[PDB]
Symmetry: D2
Subunit: 471 residues, 4 copies
Amino acid sequence: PMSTGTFVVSQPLNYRGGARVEPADASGTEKAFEPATGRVIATFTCSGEKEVNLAVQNAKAAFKIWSQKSGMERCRILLEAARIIREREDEIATMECINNGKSIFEARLDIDISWQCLEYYAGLAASMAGEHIQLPGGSFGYTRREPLGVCVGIGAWNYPFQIASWKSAPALACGNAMVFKPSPFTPVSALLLAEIYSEAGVPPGLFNVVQGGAATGQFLCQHPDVAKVSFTGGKSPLIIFSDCDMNNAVKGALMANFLTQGQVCCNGTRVFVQKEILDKFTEEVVKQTQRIKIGDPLLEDTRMGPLINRPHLERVLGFVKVAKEQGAKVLCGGDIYVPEDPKLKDGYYMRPCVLTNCRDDMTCVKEEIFGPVMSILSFDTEAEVLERANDTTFGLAAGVFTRDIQRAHRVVAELQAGTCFINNYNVSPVELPFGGYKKSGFGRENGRVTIEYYSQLKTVCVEMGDVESAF
Amino acid sequence: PMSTGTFVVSQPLNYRGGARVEPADASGTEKAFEPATGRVIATFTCSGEKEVNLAVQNAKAAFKIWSQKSGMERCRILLEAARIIREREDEIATMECINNGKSIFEARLDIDISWQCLEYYAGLAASMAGEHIQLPGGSFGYTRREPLGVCVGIGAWNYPFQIASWKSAPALACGNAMVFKPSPFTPVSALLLAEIYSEAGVPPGLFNVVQGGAATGQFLCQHPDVAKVSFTGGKSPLIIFSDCDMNNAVKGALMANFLTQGQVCCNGTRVFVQKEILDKFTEEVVKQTQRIKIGDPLLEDTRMGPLINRPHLERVLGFVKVAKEQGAKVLCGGDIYVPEDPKLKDGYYMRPCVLTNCRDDMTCVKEEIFGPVMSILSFDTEAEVLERANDTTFGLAAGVFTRDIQRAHRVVAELQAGTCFINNYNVSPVELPFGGYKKSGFGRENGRVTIEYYSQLKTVCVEMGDVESAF
Amino acid sequence: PMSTGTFVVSQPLNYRGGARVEPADASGTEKAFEPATGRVIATFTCSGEKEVNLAVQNAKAAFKIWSQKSGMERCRILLEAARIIREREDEIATMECINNGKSIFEARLDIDISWQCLEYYAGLAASMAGEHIQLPGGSFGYTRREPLGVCVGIGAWNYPFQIASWKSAPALACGNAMVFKPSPFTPVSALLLAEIYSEAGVPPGLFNVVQGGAATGQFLCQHPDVAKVSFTGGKSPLIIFSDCDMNNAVKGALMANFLTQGQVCCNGTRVFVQKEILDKFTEEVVKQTQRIKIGDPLLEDTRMGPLINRPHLERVLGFVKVAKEQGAKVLCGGDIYVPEDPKLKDGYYMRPCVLTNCRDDMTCVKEEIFGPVMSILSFDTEAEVLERANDTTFGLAAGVFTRDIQRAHRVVAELQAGTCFINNYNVSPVELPFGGYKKSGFGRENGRVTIEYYSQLKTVCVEMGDVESAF
Amino acid sequence: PMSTGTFVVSQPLNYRGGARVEPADASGTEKAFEPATGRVIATFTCSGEKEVNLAVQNAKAAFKIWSQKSGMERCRILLEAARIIREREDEIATMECINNGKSIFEARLDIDISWQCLEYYAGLAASMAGEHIQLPGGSFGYTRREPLGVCVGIGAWNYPFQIASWKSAPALACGNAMVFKPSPFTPVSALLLAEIYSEAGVPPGLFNVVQGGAATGQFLCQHPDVAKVSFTGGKSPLIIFSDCDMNNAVKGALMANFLTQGQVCCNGTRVFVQKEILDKFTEEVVKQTQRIKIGDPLLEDTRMGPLINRPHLERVLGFVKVAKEQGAKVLCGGDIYVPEDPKLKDGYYMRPCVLTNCRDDMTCVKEEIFGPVMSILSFDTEAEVLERANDTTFGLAAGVFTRDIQRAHRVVAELQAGTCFINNYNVSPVELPFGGYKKSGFGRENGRVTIEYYSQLKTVCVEMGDVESAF
């Protein structure tokens, strides 16, 4: 029932004690946009010290109720929330599209990851166990993972609903309360999650929302009743060898660069192509790039939406200008795009860019752009690429395309990237295990480790006999 | 063959590439003492930036060799190290006593923990595995725990050999190298571990030692080739109820206060005693305290050695003076002790102190002393104690003495302490699981969690089929 | 909308390919009853060899489809099944009462365990992973837990819907098909589960139901295409010491003996009471037993329903007759009960029995009755009870009532029972972890172990280098 | 110090109470041989019912002591046993060859796995923990893995010392005793393990040895005080595709067939070779097979020793005769071998056999020979091999040789074998994880699962509040 060019926020954008509330305090005002049209969908207040304290106080009170509930009870409520997310999926997805600009196609995938996340941690809540140890003379020791208390979740604008779910679901599962601060660019979708938690049966104040930027963030970090804060080198390389499957290598390169309008750090933007296939590959990539459907993100066939902001679009367009000044050849795009739909005339659109004759010294190769810009770097040998792509940090991903699996594993072994892809590339947030493949699951280690972030181990030792005095 | 009043360091105190070396660069000079006699056992150079660089560079080189060895090979070496520590135990324990001042009796327990710790992480090294996940169409995702590289360990003076062992054993078991900076108070024992690692078969420079203070520490933290750095409300309460086992409560109180000369934060120095037993308990506690054998730490019957240095002893005596000014009754000790052996005359000795008529407003009750000082606070009800001991942080321990186990579990539940003891109290470092009970073992969570600190998870996704393009 | 004295089966009681079917081959005929009224609710054919073959062949085909689906897809379906069980709970619970005779109070608790069980194994399906190991020279090894194929589940009459869910949920979560053979006494409720699995989206034939007894069972076990079969000394002691909480000890004794009409092996029927409290306890237990509401199991206030069938009721009454012949004093019950409601006149009712002056030589003390019969044995010392109750097997449970927790732990340590209760008793099936406490959860070991029963570990080794020939 | 043609057993071959004993009771007599010479090294008594009882009663007494020792103490003893095995390795390995006939080369590998096994389970013993669960109102539930009691380990003749170690280490690590029955062919080496356990500090009776056959085995299974018994369709295929690395494929085929004189079921004896490379491969395999050094197993350069005994050697030669009658071409070997050393003149030697023009209808292809016999079957397509090798059971292994990894993984997926090898083949016992690769480790799952086999989970529930009565 919701469409592009019509949405306007009509309710308060903070959320405390199970209801939408206006900030009690100001730390500034921000404007949220519909990137597809360039319309202001909200002029909202950033939360001040007093508003931040009301949220934390109200979450501390909920924490006391929720932490005392069983893992079984907590699981029940989180599984309900996942069911509500699943039922209201298209409504949630369209709202994320309206405010962020990603295609409905990509918003649905992010929403899926969100309710899957909830189910996973709900399951972990119901199956949590500590250790029990036997001590001589009937004595014993035991451990328990306990919540920390009020957790602060800091959002980002690229995956607003998903970052909200990903932070709250494990924190809540362990028995914590959370005060969530969305990115000021994207305030809207986090409130849908807040409402859903309430509807599911979460105690009022367990999941609170405070809008604001840096000042709000500082107030949250400095708060004495806040237990923990959950925040959110060379760029991600993609190595294409001459022996690879060309069609799959091209598909992978496009997915690596133009999903989420290339606005993510997990994007494999440094495309190293072997000299022999270099000409054939570039020809095919440009042909395919020029065919990407740009327009209204609510349209099912749209694959490229607008960029997050006008400042952001301008910054990306500046990278393109610097690249051709540094000697790169713009094969296609990197120009402002004006869509055929008149309602989209002032949207933050640009044609996806493919740059060739790229060098390691270039700032477009050295720096993360956060726009749809592919840098094609030519290479000759396996030793050369490994030497050129060594500067990759653990926090980044990497992709390798070669029919030789000895070569593939050898390249992956030497690469310092945390996530490596052989004959594929997935653009998925860092938190998601196994490179965010659809039918992957989460394994057990991801959950165990993220649970440890939102908890602490309490140890109890019960002496059944007499004390062994050294004195 | 080694005794008190005779030891003098005759070799360099830094350790690089399998040998004792002298600092290349200097950041100051320090004096290490024999606390039992007050003798200078070493005048050593604090490592400067160039010395810190040589250590990290030599360890970066060792890591490259060691990380490539199998977990089985790494286990083999760490098990040999444990065997050597076990064989050379008395020699290591006397060295620990000479520089630190703890009784031989307590030093042996710390050396036992140290070789047990190596055996544990050796075992984990041999049994480490990542996850394997199945993906549609014969594709698969998998994970590997990888070492980080060069890790920094920062020693403390209260458990020198044990802290060196505790930080280096997991770090090395993951495939990392380590540059260790002992407390400048206690430089000696870390070199015995250094030598043992070499003897066990560790590649040269895998476990390096840099002496120094804050300046050396800063150069280590600021070093770009350093992957990780492992560093070392109210104080620990002990609640004695009128229904408890008096003899066990007294034994527990003495252990909680006078082990390691009361110089640890783990010590349960805030002793809350119920009004009825208060008189009977204090009488027994003073009787038992006055019987603690003070003297040469290398003597088998010694239970109390000297304090770490003269500044620390003076600071502790200052606390006692302020306490009697604040209105506390010194029941015994808190005075400088002159041992009967003349060689021990300038040792940092004091009689263990018992203070009564203590208040929550007193600085001796509010502040951690790091000396043998017991503060006895009278209480009337269970609600009162819980309200008075609520200010305890998670990093601290707590002890409860009551014959009513419902009362015991109720008290432990309300207490915020990370380690709670029912009808006992163990003074053991926070790292040690299950309150450091002698025949406890480590369980599996401790090892798993500490391994995660010294490692990182690498994910590889192997696509067996074709790429599913969104475009 | 469903009530006692009106239900009659109107559909076939076998289930294959997503529909109810009449057995293709016979192995006899059975009659299922409404124990509350003594009415025949069904006359059904026991499955023959050809019918058993059709169900295993059908399951083998569904297995091939299901085992190829992802853990995530399997989880989705199982969570839908749990949702449907939860929605249709009262309808399932009344059906369980109608055929089995347990109170709706207990029936609801049984249906709760069933859908909780489903959710737990759905969660495990989505998080399943094998191991990944690194081998020298880039080679690697990995494991995968694979389904077995067609699994066979044998039902029991005391927990019909619960046993069906408990066996099918883990088997299905792994990727197996299941042919389920309910107890001929209770054929009805398993078909509600089979219909729910279908409704949830399970492939036709993944959960097939074959009616029959021993012959049907043998054919299933003998079948070559059946991977695995899941089947359904002294008796469970309850030790009441003179120092215990009398009211809690009485409540625990009633729960331990008269839940599920005392028709389970988990029942703590051997009640050892210390000489001093023996008189006081017996007086209170009889007073409380005589207050148990016997009647229509569909009534909310009913705590005791009828016994499974007339043969069973007669067998239990026989035990009571032998007991008074052996010298026991029937304090209350053990007599045929004729309920006030005329529609229940022909139901399998008896008054719950309390026997005193019991001896270890008595057959009522030596043998499991499977009826509401409590045997009170007097005892004098802790050493005496431990000697008299030592004959308890690991498969049984045990209960201890004492205010002294050292005594409690000492008794539990010496007892050979697999499940021990201190100051409580739960009557729960063996499969359920942590003595089947409400708000316990399942922990992680239970699920892990039961998943291992329904799966097998496949190992794959990928050689990346050259083969190291011994020759 | 020990050499071929000189060894004679001079001590009793049963072991009870920390000493070698003569069986109390008999069930026949057997002769043990030196397969290299054909000499009788022992004429020993098979254990009767009374001897089996004495061993069990003795073990039961040591269990009571050992089960009460801490996990830490058992670990210490098992690590000592591993150290003694490691020190006395060459002595144990020569004894293993003397009686079994495997090459000292392979015997040393067996002995390595043995002491590695002990270390792994020693580590698990020290780190064992149960679960702890929190229940409402301060109540709690906890689990503990307890030993079973007296376990029985049945030996095999192909890995005598290794099987003894593989069964005794997890049982003893769990707190059980074990009564071990070696294969009557190989009685000697198990006594070396028995002696070592004693020397390490194991209580007398912990690891007892009863010599005997099937009769002795039955007595052990039938014994009422025995808790558990640990016992020892087409054959293992090896698929060589035309696209593979020929030299590696040949090496792998020789390893798969001629290691342990081809006397194991894990040997990949069904060698399917693609029509194109068939001629080239056969030529190379025969060339390499003819170069295998047959002789004194104690000689360092020996790769093939004699077969276990005269009957086995004769049975294998019979298979070769039937094969050429069925139409197979003996390319090399399958003939009695007379070694140049005159002391080995009556040893059970034969030349390793290579058969070509093999059919699926042949008994040499259908049946497991347990001798050095390779059956080369020609094939044309991938679909054909998968159809011909489908009959492989889960208990068997499989090997695939192809440069195409998609093909390799596709073949491995379709194969029903429990262990699959890509571009390699390891002949290792089933118990060993990750196809028994040298620097593999055991991972965590293997140990977890073999501990569960030798233990039972005891659950304790502590009620802190009031009993919730249904009545």
